[PDB]
Amino acid sequence: RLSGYCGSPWRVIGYHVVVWMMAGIPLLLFRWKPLWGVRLRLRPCNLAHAETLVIEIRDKEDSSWQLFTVQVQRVLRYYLFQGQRYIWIETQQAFYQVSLLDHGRSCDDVHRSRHGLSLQDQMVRKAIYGPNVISIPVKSYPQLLVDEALNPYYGFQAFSIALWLADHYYWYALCIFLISSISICLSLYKTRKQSQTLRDMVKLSMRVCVCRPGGEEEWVDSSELVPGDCLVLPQEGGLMPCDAALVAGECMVNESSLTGESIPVLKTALPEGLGPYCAETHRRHTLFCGTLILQARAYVGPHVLAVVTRTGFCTAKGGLVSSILHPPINFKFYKHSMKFVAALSVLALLGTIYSIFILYRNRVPLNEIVIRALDLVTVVVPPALPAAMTVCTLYAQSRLRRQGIFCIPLRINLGGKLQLVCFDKTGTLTEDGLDVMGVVPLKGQAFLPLVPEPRRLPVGPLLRALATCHALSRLQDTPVGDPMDLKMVESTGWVLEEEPQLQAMEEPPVPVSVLHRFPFSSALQRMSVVVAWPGATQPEAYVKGSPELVAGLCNPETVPTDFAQMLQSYTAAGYRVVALASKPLPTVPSLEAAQQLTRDTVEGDLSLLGLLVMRNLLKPQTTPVIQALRRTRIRAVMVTGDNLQTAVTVARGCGMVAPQEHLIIVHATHPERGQPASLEFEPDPRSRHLALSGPTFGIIVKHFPKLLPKVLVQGTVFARMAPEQKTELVCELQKLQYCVGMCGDGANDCGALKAADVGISLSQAEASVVSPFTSSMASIECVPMVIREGRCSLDTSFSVFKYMALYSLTQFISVLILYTINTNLGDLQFLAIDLVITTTVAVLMSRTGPALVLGRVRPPGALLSVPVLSSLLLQMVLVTGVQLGGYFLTLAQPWFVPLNRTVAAPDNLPNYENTVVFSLSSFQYLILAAAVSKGAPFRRPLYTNVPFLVALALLSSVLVGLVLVPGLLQGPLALRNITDTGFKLLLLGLVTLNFVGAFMLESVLDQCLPACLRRLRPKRASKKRFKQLERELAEQ
């Protein structure tokens, strides 16, 4: 983020204190456009060298913040923003972030020496970088509650409680207070739980060994570590206190908590004096914070030495934690409710205008008129609204946890509107285990193949190349490492034995030892090893890489002419194949290369030896999930780095690419490299599917920008994709306004997961920080679960909107109808209606889960859609008609009359007006809940969640019992009894008529009649995504 800054000290003690002693009212006003509010009161102008209050000025940012400056100990002026420290430097006369001496301005020589820091005073290093800990703040209950109890909604609720108390409506005020307290408790619990769960991810404290200049040693706590300090890895122990660079020795770590992959990763000592150092160059020579150490070996001497380079939030996990906690925006925002709220507000305004008009006709005193008029606007805003909403997210998260998906959440609703998904091939769409079908000897005989053979008999460079070209290690009493290396070593039958210090057991010629090793990285598809055995003239070198890459990394004469056909035959069958190569590596070059640690020299003029053939089968759950996802018109795309033929075969097996397919290849020598197209198996078939290679996608995006947009739309199989290209592909797809989610397993695609709208990890076992979503089950069947849960949550939220609006308007209309005559509902009646009937039903409404199968129809877009408003208005017409009919029916019977213009106060409540209206409205409050809560395409039937049905039945039974002329609970509580037996036959008949009419109307509106009418004359809507979608019609 880019932004300038400015600051100045406080205004000198004087008029400002006294003026904003009174000017505290505009606090709510300044919540919008806060820059002027801080310019007043606090901020004068000052030079940019003695600032205390520090504020930002935009360069690309749109928000605003103010910061506090602190000095310690040169007084070291500094300030912290978003967890990043900034320190004033005299030479530059500007604030500088704490990254000096890092990011390529220090070389491997000074870094290499950099020993023991110094027996210096603690001020210089500790103060600048601070304590080494990722401090997630904690707050006390009084400190926490003030952050949400000051919202304008709760201020208005307090105003209402004050208003009702002045009117002697004691009971209703208590109900409002209880509901507000419940809402506050729910929000506080949510915030506390989220903060606590995030805090657990941060590691705990411990103490390590740290050396000092000379020969001294120390046993200090981890909190005292600072950059430049050298520490010794303890007893091959556990977690890494902080990021550090390995200067001496070799070890391996488990980076599942940071990269999401549980496969052990080898690390090697940092080369000396090569050049400037950086995280990218340090990837295979550094240890990241929060990563376990499995085994460490002392190359030479009694210690394995690492040098700390980053501490606190600056560490690798610190940035991920900051990005987890601080956020920026989904860009699928929901700012569409303002106009619906305005539409509701205009009705409220006209209703209160009518109330104040008619209320004057009753000659009510000049003071009682205004309070009773204000009561209308007071009741329009529905209490418990925040409570019904904070609980929906809790329900969704709890249900997701129950199924083994651990979401970090605002993306629950986002995941329900996915339209394109990316998948990896190995591990994700297929089995992790690998079966070896043998090797193809190529070490002679006119370069001709010797036919595959699953053997271990012959002795030669190929056998020991297989036996030693790996990075296996012994943990406890079993080997651990890459499954592919384990399977290869199993085929040979050689056993890993417990300068080189690693050797193979089986000794047909003689036992073999490994002098040097180069670990793998996803950027380059190869690994190297230096091997020596007794009696050898000089050590040899063996490498293992992708067949295509190594085929071009060896002597051109050695590789056979028909290598392409040989590689295509096995790959086209669905096998996963590799290649092996070896180098004579003469004596002096062999000795110097290992000493100098230069990798380029070893991976030079090699000689191809053979190919390993592996069998990798699809997971049984892969095909049904893909078929179900694709049936609902959701695009599925394969992003893989494997060979293109194998990826195409797997995609065909998975069910993808049913119709014709085509290939685009890099075969062109012209400087622009015009890309030809070939039919996998002439006109331009618009039903074609496109498959691209890594370099092909890398050059097309560069040289043919305008051909790219209609290639991504049709691309299905991406092969030989580099780890950085996956993120590029994900970002490019989003430029088409796509909503892309990705499911990845390996560590190479960690960056792609972050870029995607929703990222799901399959092999991970906890709610880590790498991806927003983590799946404990190693299968792709979780994506449909996420999609269905998201759409169900969205539908539940819309239903909550509708029910809350209906209840608010119903209460408003009932109160106004009472106002038309001369009477008001009793305070106890309001307490009942609000606290019990509305709240218990609203809170329990969101319990029902998602449907068992996905549907073609997508969830609703916005509230302003004609069907929602039309249904609301029709339901209100029905409700008001029912209420007015019930009211008018009473006049037929001999019923006396209320003492209008005699008392005209809420003390004559024992009358026939409030009784019937209350009885009819109480039933409607429950009837409306069922009508709108009903669901099918996205939610399970209403009778699925037992508690909601039980509560509805209990409330309906209680109300019906009340109606059926009891001698109790109906007289003392401001209700009037009637001897005529019109309850069962007529009043309940009208209630049932309302019930059936509302449900029939809701069914009619649910059916496609309202939507089909809107289809005329055109169909296009105002949503901008349709503008990009229509381009597919022109592109196909």
Ligand SMILES: Nc1ncnc2c1ncn2[C@@H]1O[C@H](COP(=O)(O)OP(=O)(O)OP(=O)(O)O)[C@@H](O)[C@H]1O
């Ligand atoms: N020992 C090895 N270490 C690393 N990569 C290897 C090794 N042997 C072969 N490879 C090659 O790595 C190439 C691609 O690297 P990458 O890590 O992207 O493969 P991958 O992880 O199998 O891809 P995917 O995740 O799609 O399966 C593959 O062609 C594979 O043959």
Ligand SMILES: [Mg+2]
């Ligand atoms: Mg994988």
